[PDB]
Amino acid sequence: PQPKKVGAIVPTSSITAKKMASVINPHSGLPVLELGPGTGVITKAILARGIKPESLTAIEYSTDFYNQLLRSYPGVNFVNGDAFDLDATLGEHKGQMFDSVISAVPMLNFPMAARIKLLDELLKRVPHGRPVVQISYGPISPIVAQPHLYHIRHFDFIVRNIPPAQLWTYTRA
Numbered sequence: 001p002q003p004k005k006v007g008a009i010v011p012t013s014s015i016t017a018k019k020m021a022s023v024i025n026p027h028s029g030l031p032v033l034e035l036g037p038g039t040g041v042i043t044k045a046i047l048a049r050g051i052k053p054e055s056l057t058a059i060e061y062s063t064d065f066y067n068q069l070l071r072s073y074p075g076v077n078f079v080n081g082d083a084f085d086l087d088a089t090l091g092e093h094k095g096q097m098f099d100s101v102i103s104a105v106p107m108l109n110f111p112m113a114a115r116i117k118l119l120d121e122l123l124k125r126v127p128h129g130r131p132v133v134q135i136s137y138g139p140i141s142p143i144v145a146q147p148h149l150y151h152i153r154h155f156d157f158i159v160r161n162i163p164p165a166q167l168w169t170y171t172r173a
C-alpha cells in the first residue's frame with residue numbers, strides 16, 4: 001500500500017538534533033549560527049547546551065515559521081531571510097565570528113554551485129578549524145568535495161530519523 005508523508009516532511013528527530021548541537025563549544029565565548037530553524041527542534045537542542053539565547057542567531061526564510069519562533073523562543077536572535085544571502089541577513093562581514101554553524105537548510109533544493117559558494121562564505125565567519133554541520137539524506141555529501149576550499153568529514157548516521165539522517169561536517173582547508 002501507498003505510504004504518506006514521503007520524503008523529509010516531518011520534523012527532525014530529537015536524537016539527530018542533539019548530535020548536530022554536540023559540535024558546539026559553549027565555553028568559547030562566541031555565538032552560534034543556525035540555518036533553517038523551522039519548528040525549533042534544533043534550536044531547542046542548541047539552547048540545551050547552555051548557549052545564552054541572545055548568542056544564538058537563526059536564519060529562517062518562512063515568515064510564518066519566523067513569527068512562531070519569536071513567540072516560542074524569547075531572546076533568540078531570529079532573522080527572517082535567505083541563508084544564501086549572508087550580507088542581507090547578517091550584514092557585510094566586518095569581523096563577527098561564530099563558534100560553529102548548524103545547518104538544516106534543504107541543500108538539494110539548490111544548485112550545487114550555490115551550495116559550494118554558501119559553504120565557502122560560512123567558513124569565512126567561523127575561526128579556522130571550526131565546523132559547519134549539515135543534515136542530509138542521500139549516501140553522499142550534499143556538497144561535493146573541493147579540497148582546496150574545505151575538508152569533508154562524515155559525522156554520524158541516525159537510523160531512527162524519518163528518513164534516516166546523515167550528518168556531515170565541513171572545515172576550512
Ligand SMILES: CSC[C@H]1O[C@@H](n2cnc3c(N)ncnc32)[C@H](O)[C@@H]1O
Pocket residue numbers: 035036037038039059060061062065081082083084104105106
Ligand atoms: C527544518 S526544514 C528546512 C527549513 O529551512 C527553511 N529554509 C529553507 N531554505 C531556506 C533558506 N535559503 N534560508 C533560510 N531558511 C530556509 C525552511 O523554511 C524550513 O523551515
